[PDB]
Amino acid sequence: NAMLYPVLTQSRLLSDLSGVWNFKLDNGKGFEEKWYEKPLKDADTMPVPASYNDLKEGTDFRDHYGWVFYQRNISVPEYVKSQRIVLRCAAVTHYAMIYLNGKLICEHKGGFLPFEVELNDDLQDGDNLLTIAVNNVIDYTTLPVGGKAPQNNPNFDFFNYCGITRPVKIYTTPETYINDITVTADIDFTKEEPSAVLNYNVEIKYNNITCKVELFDEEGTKLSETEGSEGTFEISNVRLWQPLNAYLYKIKVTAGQDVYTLPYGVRSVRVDGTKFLINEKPFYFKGYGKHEDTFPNGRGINLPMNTKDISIMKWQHANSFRTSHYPYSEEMMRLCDEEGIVVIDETTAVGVNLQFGGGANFGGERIGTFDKEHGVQTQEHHKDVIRDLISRDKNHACVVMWSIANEPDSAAEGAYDYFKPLYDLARELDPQKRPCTLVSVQGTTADTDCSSQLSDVICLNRYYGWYFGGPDLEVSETGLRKELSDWGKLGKPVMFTEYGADTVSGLHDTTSVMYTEEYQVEYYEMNNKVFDEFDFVVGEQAWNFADFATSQSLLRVQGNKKGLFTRDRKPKMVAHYFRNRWSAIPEFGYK
Amino acid sequence: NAMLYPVLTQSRLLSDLSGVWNFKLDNGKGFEEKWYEKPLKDADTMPVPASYNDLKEGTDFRDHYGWVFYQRNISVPEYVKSQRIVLRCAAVTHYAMIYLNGKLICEHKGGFLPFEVELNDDLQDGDNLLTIAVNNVIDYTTLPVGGKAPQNNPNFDFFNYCGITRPVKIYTTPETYINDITVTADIDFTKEEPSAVLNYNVEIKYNNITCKVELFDEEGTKLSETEGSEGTFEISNVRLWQPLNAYLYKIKVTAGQDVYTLPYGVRSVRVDGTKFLINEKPFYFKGYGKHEDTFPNGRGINLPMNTKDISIMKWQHANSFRTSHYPYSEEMMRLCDEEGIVVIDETTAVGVNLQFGGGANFGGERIGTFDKEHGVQTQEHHKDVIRDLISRDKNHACVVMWSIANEPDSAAEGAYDYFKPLYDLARELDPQKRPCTLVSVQGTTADTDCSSQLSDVICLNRYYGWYFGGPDLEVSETGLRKELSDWGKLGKPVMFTEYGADTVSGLHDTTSVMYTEEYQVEYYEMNNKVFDEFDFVVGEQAWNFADFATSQSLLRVQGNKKGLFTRDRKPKMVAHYFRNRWSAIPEFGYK
Ligand SMILES: Cc1cc(Nc2ncc(Cl)c(N)n2)c(OC(C)C)cc1C1CCN([C@@H]2O[C@H](C(=O)O)[C@@H](O)[C@H](O)[C@H]2O)CC1
Ligand SMILES: Cc1cc(Nc2ncc(Cl)c(N)n2)c(OC(C)C)cc1C1CCN([C@@H]2O[C@H](C(=O)O)[C@@H](O)[C@H](O)[C@H]2O)CC1
């Protein structure tokens, strides 16, 4: 349930298992021949962390269907068995099965969230045979959703990168440990010098022991102390965490023979009318929808590209993005804390719409998305994911909002009844009672979108001037203004979380045509002109930040080319257009 | 002196320090204000491992001159202070100064080789302030060499990527530990089923204790045992490590309360006449000169790209490369062991030639390279580097040769006397008495090159058809045949370690011109035609494997575009040409 980011501490170690592991593709007979017990014969090499799909040649590898086997030797000195020994998987994509010496010791469904397992019982003095098996199959029971029509069929527009996506490490704790930590903030904005009070709450598991919780500022000075599993601080004249201007207090929580620190930023999130308020000021989202996508790591974690992406944002004068379409690495989340970037944390819930791909049929009847017997089997797991996500990222001052799903069939029979339990579960599990949304596919209207009722903020993905209307930007404008005007009638805040136009870097014309850099700039001029007409529009997020990989098809020119930047982060012409527009537009008070 | 690759073992831990550190650029007043004692004020973020030059925007960052400061908190639990606690720096570029709490505890000159420091004495229960400062200045006393004409002036054709290039980890050992391990092999090739005997030799530092050394095969079976600091095995019907067909025995060396394993491949390297023999067969080098260069890591380690590079080689039917122009990561070296790739391990000794850049002058007299007062001050350090390199990579069955320097002024007054001490030091420190070379700049002839005497193999970097003769490939051919014919008269083996032609991916013509993909293919046709005429040519290595970054100048179209592949590893047309040529050409017996 609870998952704190493993770091180095006086009481806990951190042994990164990253490196070149042994690796074999399953042929079917894999589990039969109990490969997890023996070391893999005729093996292959494969770095961890990383998606495996692009690190070898040939379609047989990129396009593989099913299971892969990672192996490796691990060994701990007996002098460390005094502590409890846990194996944390930052993320395995999609389904993981972890053996040790040949004995299944764990299982996890869910390809983008961490999960751990205790090792004490199964550790065997000497070198041990660690085998993690990974499965890439997606169907109507996975999140993201795999379609219908031996090969996967992603019901989503990005490539099915699989393998050990994020790092596999080992850490330890004294057998009575800190397990969760929760921290909230009530900020008093009436004062001339605003001050605030932090509510904490530590959870443990000989659980009776002293509970020290000290508070430092970013320089390192100590400022307060308190005792108890729950407690309080009264930071006066507090330094508010702000977008593009972060401040991180530190929180050293001593308890028994265990210490853990947690950066924390003080800020307030509140909707009010047509105004998305951060620290009781009216925000405007400037930014993009992103992917964890790079060459050749695939979806694998890339701490260098994370910092380079953030550099480019601060260069472009952006302030937000959205973890389309799955939670990002803990490391990227921590970085947004230090760097001051507003994030829209979003679940793996993409592809629950079921009209894509010309749809699937049953008895000559086209299935509806939320059909009880033939449609998405994903609410059980969709709920697990809301739980794991918020348990992980609850404390991140950068997360100002939750995205329950991306482009679900939210205007359909069965939709409201699928999402209500999920929103409720989100607004009840988030200690900071943060706004909740979902990203509405093209086609929905204010009248028909089950998001008009459940959502604190309306998030549209619209393509007026690309799929709908292009190349006639004038007509497309009238379309966008008409629909946008309608959404105004809800009185809620509206933002675009996705708009864009495929552009192959290099293609130009003085009089533009689709796919050229000139057309891409003109498309954003038209859209943005209309955005600026309506004071309830509180955010623009382009799709996408950068070119990224997709399953092949006629519509996809060697991937999705809707990026403002090429896949190696080099600016298309539109990147300068946006950088100039965002420069003349503030974080606060644009309305 | 001795540096074994830190791994996970029953007796030793491995705590990778990689992550986002604190980071500030020096302004001059850095050391004055003793920033290493306090935590950095107004800091910045920076992933480690990685060059910092490309991870922020603006020339002030990319082009910075001088010092940078990395900071970070480290903390060990007192229950681990029983063992000795060492901080290993895989590589800092160029000069590192390591503080702890404010007390200089280490220093290293040398930007591409590992170096460690014991922490027990300076560790202070609690969180500690680890500050590594890094310096990028190059001049006549550094390897590589920095030129003359506040900015660096690389006397080499690649970008001055600096910062913490390879990972910083922490490992431990029992206070009497294994420190080095050496292993050689005499192979008996007379038998029908060749067998061999391995000579080992362990070094330690209560040094009196038992010495167990067990031998396993790759599957994991144990095959032998022996006791003693020195000893022997008699692997019968042995499995010879071969190029593109690796086999790795494992060697578990128990000694006191310490275990360490070391993969090892059995093979023989021997020159004989005009024939470079691996396992007493006549090899032909197929491959390229490489860089540790990727976006945006710079020179920083990239285990995903390492595996992807090796995939591409096996796709192209290559078998070798050369660590131009500095030693690569230990991880890449280990990988070549498992993958079966022949490496030419090479020192940081590039830019000792001093005729580049129009040269530097003194009293109206142009300085010669090896002038005793005004020229290269680098033999002291050049010798350290030969030592560190061979102490690190001595056991790697993939290293079949040593490159002392790249394009030194080897036909000049003073040259022979500079290199003789260095070769000798190389042929005496390498337990396997492996061939030694240096890469000869254009201009040298057999008669004039001090490499004709010192070197077991002649390695030419020639550009007939690019800088010299291009665009007239016919004339250039006559030039190449004439010079090449000459080198034949030494009776030694000759190989080209560098040839190539800048090619901007995308530029084409039916009737080619320079910089097009068609010209690049034609240039290699001409060169290779002449190579194939001479049976003493035993290797072709293209320059370069992939496009890489350089200091700016008119001659460098957004970097060095001589790659067979673009900087993101995508094939230029020549890559298919080579893949087809190398397919019809074996590892052995091409002559
Ligand atoms: C092109 C299309 C059309 C329709 N409608 C429709 N199609 C064909 C015909 Cl003949 C017809 N009459 N109508 C449509 O809705 C129907 C099918 C339910 C959906 C969408 C795409 C699905 C994915 N998106 C979002 O934008 C990104 C991108 O496309 O680049 C994705 O990468 C990203 O995940 C995603 O967030 C945009 C629309
Ligand atoms: C172009 C040149 C010319 C001369 N000679 C000369 N220049 C101008 C004039 Cl007017 C003149 N009459 N003669 C020369 O030798 C003299 C200067 C000592 C050296 C070289 C380059 C130095 C670097 N190399 C190697 O190839 C790679 C690459 O160039 O791409 C590098 O990246 C790589 O490090 C390196 O291994 C090739 C030659």
Short mmCIF file of all heavy atoms in Angstrom, two decimals, chain B residues 316-340:
data_model
loop_
_atom_site.label_atom_id
_atom_site.label_comp_id
_atom_site.label_asym_id
_atom_site.label_seq_id
_atom_site.Cartn_x
_atom_site.Cartn_y
_atom_site.Cartn_z
N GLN B 316 25.79 -5.16 -38.28
CA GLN B 316 26.63 -4.74 -39.39
C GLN B 316 27.72 -5.76 -39.72
O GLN B 316 28.37 -5.63 -40.77
CB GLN B 316 27.29 -3.38 -39.11
CG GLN B 316 27.64 -2.60 -40.37
CD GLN B 316 27.91 -1.10 -40.12
OE1 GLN B 316 28.36 -0.68 -39.04
NE2 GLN B 316 27.63 -0.28 -41.14
N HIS B 317 27.91 -6.77 -38.86
CA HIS B 317 28.94 -7.80 -39.07
C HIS B 317 30.32 -7.22 -38.79
O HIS B 317 31.29 -7.52 -39.50
CB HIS B 317 28.89 -8.40 -40.49
CG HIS B 317 27.63 -9.14 -40.78
ND1 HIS B 317 26.72 -8.72 -41.74
CD2 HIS B 317 27.12 -10.28 -40.26
CE1 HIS B 317 25.71 -9.56 -41.79
NE2 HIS B 317 25.93 -10.52 -40.90
N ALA B 318 30.42 -6.38 -37.78
CA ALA B 318 31.69 -5.86 -37.30
C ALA B 318 32.21 -6.77 -36.19
O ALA B 318 31.51 -7.70 -35.75
CB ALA B 318 31.50 -4.43 -36.80
N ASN B 319 33.45 -6.53 -35.74
CA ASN B 319 33.99 -7.36 -34.66
C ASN B 319 34.91 -6.59 -33.72
O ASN B 319 35.28 -7.09 -32.66
CB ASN B 319 34.75 -8.56 -35.22
CG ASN B 319 35.93 -8.16 -36.12
OD1 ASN B 319 36.64 -7.19 -35.85
ND2 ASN B 319 36.12 -8.90 -37.20
N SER B 320 35.26 -5.37 -34.07
CA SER B 320 36.20 -4.63 -33.25
C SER B 320 35.85 -3.15 -33.24
O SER B 320 35.23 -2.61 -34.16
CB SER B 320 37.60 -4.80 -33.78
OG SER B 320 37.60 -4.45 -35.16
N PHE B 321 36.27 -2.48 -32.19
CA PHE B 321 36.43 -1.05 -32.25
C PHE B 321 37.63 -0.66 -31.39
O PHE B 321 38.34 -1.53 -30.87
CB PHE B 321 35.14 -0.36 -31.82
CG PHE B 321 34.79 -0.59 -30.39
CD1 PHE B 321 35.27 0.24 -29.41
CD2 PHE B 321 33.96 -1.63 -30.04
CE1 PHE B 321 34.93 0.03 -28.08
CE2 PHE B 321 33.61 -1.83 -28.72
CZ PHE B 321 34.10 -1.01 -27.74
N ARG B 322 37.84 0.65 -31.22
CA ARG B 322 38.96 1.19 -30.49
C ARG B 322 38.46 2.29 -29.59
O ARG B 322 37.71 3.15 -30.03
CB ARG B 322 40.05 1.71 -31.43
CG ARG B 322 41.00 2.73 -30.74
CD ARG B 322 42.18 3.10 -31.61
NE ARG B 322 41.78 3.95 -32.71
CZ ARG B 322 42.03 5.25 -32.78
NH1 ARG B 322 42.72 5.87 -31.84
NH2 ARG B 322 41.59 5.94 -33.84
N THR B 323 38.87 2.28 -28.33
CA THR B 323 38.40 3.29 -27.40
C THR B 323 39.03 4.65 -27.67
O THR B 323 39.61 5.27 -26.77
CB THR B 323 38.70 2.85 -25.98
OG1 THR B 323 40.12 2.71 -25.84
CG2 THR B 323 38.02 1.50 -25.68
N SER B 324 38.90 5.16 -28.90
CA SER B 324 39.25 6.55 -29.18
C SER B 324 38.44 7.49 -28.30
O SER B 324 37.22 7.35 -28.24
CB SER B 324 38.98 6.89 -30.65
OG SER B 324 38.19 5.91 -31.30
N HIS B 325 39.09 8.44 -27.63
CA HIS B 325 40.54 8.63 -27.49
C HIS B 325 40.81 8.74 -25.99
O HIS B 325 41.24 9.80 -25.51
CB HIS B 325 41.02 9.91 -28.17
CG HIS B 325 40.88 9.92 -29.66
ND1 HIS B 325 41.23 8.84 -30.46
CD2 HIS B 325 40.46 10.89 -30.51
CE1 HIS B 325 41.02 9.15 -31.73
NE2 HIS B 325 40.55 10.38 -31.79
N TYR B 326 40.47 7.69 -25.25
CA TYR B 326 40.43 7.69 -23.79
C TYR B 326 39.85 6.34 -23.40
O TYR B 326 39.19 5.71 -24.22
CB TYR B 326 39.58 8.84 -23.24
CG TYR B 326 38.29 9.03 -24.02
CD1 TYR B 326 37.21 8.16 -23.83
CD2 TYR B 326 38.18 10.03 -24.99
CE1 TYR B 326 36.03 8.30 -24.55
CE2 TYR B 326 37.02 10.20 -25.72
CZ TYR B 326 35.92 9.33 -25.49
OH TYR B 326 34.74 9.44 -26.21
N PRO B 327 40.09 5.84 -22.20
CA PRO B 327 39.51 4.55 -21.84
C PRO B 327 38.01 4.67 -21.63
O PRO B 327 37.53 5.67 -21.10
CB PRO B 327 40.24 4.20 -20.53
CG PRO B 327 41.56 4.93 -20.65
CD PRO B 327 41.18 6.24 -21.29
N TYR B 328 37.26 3.65 -22.05
CA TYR B 328 35.81 3.66 -21.86
C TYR B 328 35.43 3.18 -20.45
O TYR B 328 36.28 2.90 -19.60
CB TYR B 328 35.11 2.79 -22.91
CG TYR B 328 35.16 3.40 -24.29
CD1 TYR B 328 35.90 4.56 -24.53
CD2 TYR B 328 34.49 2.82 -25.36
CE1 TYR B 328 35.97 5.13 -25.77
CE2 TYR B 328 34.55 3.37 -26.63
CZ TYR B 328 35.30 4.54 -26.83
OH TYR B 328 35.39 5.14 -28.08
N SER B 329 34.13 3.12 -20.21
CA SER B 329 33.63 2.64 -18.92
C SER B 329 34.03 1.19 -18.70
O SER B 329 34.19 0.41 -19.65
CB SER B 329 32.10 2.78 -18.84
OG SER B 329 31.44 2.07 -19.89
N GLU B 330 34.26 0.85 -17.43
CA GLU B 330 34.42 -0.56 -17.07
C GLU B 330 33.24 -1.37 -17.59
O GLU B 330 33.42 -2.46 -18.16
CB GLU B 330 34.55 -0.69 -15.55
CG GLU B 330 35.85 -0.13 -14.94
CD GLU B 330 35.68 1.25 -14.32
OE1 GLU B 330 35.48 2.22 -15.09
OE2 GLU B 330 35.76 1.38 -13.07
N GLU B 331 32.02 -0.83 -17.44
CA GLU B 331 30.82 -1.57 -17.86
C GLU B 331 30.90 -1.92 -19.34
O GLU B 331 30.64 -3.06 -19.75
CB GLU B 331 29.54 -0.77 -17.56
CG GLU B 331 29.16 -0.68 -16.07
CD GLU B 331 29.90 0.44 -15.37
OE1 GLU B 331 30.84 0.97 -16.01
OE2 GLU B 331 29.55 0.79 -14.21
N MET B 332 31.28 -0.96 -20.18
CA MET B 332 31.40 -1.27 -21.61
C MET B 332 32.46 -2.34 -21.84
O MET B 332 32.32 -3.18 -22.73
CB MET B 332 31.72 0.00 -22.40
CG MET B 332 31.81 -0.17 -23.94
SD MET B 332 30.47 -1.12 -24.68
CE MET B 332 30.27 -0.35 -26.31
N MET B 333 33.53 -2.32 -21.03
CA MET B 333 34.59 -3.31 -21.18
C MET B 333 34.09 -4.70 -20.80
O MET B 333 34.27 -5.67 -21.55
CB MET B 333 35.79 -2.92 -20.32
CG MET B 333 36.56 -1.71 -20.81
SD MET B 333 37.35 -1.92 -22.41
CE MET B 333 36.03 -1.38 -23.47
N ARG B 334 33.43 -4.79 -19.64
CA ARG B 334 32.81 -6.05 -19.26
C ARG B 334 31.87 -6.55 -20.35
O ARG B 334 31.86 -7.74 -20.69
CB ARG B 334 32.07 -5.89 -17.94
CG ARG B 334 33.00 -5.83 -16.74
CD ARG B 334 32.32 -5.24 -15.53
NE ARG B 334 31.83 -6.28 -14.62
CZ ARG B 334 32.57 -7.26 -14.14
NH1 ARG B 334 33.87 -7.36 -14.41
NH2 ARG B 334 32.00 -8.19 -13.37
N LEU B 335 31.07 -5.64 -20.92
CA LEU B 335 30.11 -6.06 -21.94
C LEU B 335 30.82 -6.67 -23.14
O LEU B 335 30.36 -7.68 -23.70
CB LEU B 335 29.25 -4.88 -22.38
CG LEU B 335 27.79 -5.21 -22.73
CD1 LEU B 335 27.03 -3.93 -22.98
CD2 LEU B 335 27.73 -6.09 -23.94
N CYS B 336 31.95 -6.09 -23.56
CA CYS B 336 32.65 -6.66 -24.70
C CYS B 336 33.13 -8.08 -24.41
O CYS B 336 33.24 -8.91 -25.32
CB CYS B 336 33.81 -5.76 -25.10
SG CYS B 336 33.26 -4.15 -25.71
N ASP B 337 33.44 -8.35 -23.13
CA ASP B 337 33.79 -9.71 -22.73
C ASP B 337 32.66 -10.68 -23.03
O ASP B 337 32.86 -11.70 -23.71
CB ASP B 337 34.16 -9.73 -21.24
CG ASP B 337 35.61 -9.33 -20.98
OD1 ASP B 337 36.41 -9.33 -21.96
OD2 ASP B 337 35.95 -9.01 -19.81
N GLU B 338 31.44 -10.36 -22.53
CA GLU B 338 30.28 -11.23 -22.74
C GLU B 338 29.86 -11.29 -24.19
O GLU B 338 29.37 -12.32 -24.65
CB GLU B 338 29.10 -10.75 -21.91
CG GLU B 338 29.40 -10.52 -20.47
CD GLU B 338 28.20 -10.03 -19.74
OE1 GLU B 338 27.32 -10.87 -19.46
OE2 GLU B 338 28.13 -8.80 -19.45
N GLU B 339 30.03 -10.20 -24.93
CA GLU B 339 29.46 -10.13 -26.26
C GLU B 339 30.42 -10.58 -27.35
O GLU B 339 29.98 -10.81 -28.48
CB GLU B 339 28.98 -8.69 -26.54
CG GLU B 339 27.59 -8.37 -25.93
CD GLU B 339 26.50 -9.30 -26.45
OE1 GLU B 339 26.60 -9.71 -27.63
OE2 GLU B 339 25.56 -9.62 -25.67
N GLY B 340 31.71 -10.70 -27.05
CA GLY B 340 32.68 -11.19 -28.02
C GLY B 340 33.21 -10.16 -28.99
O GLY B 340 33.40 -10.48 -30.18
#
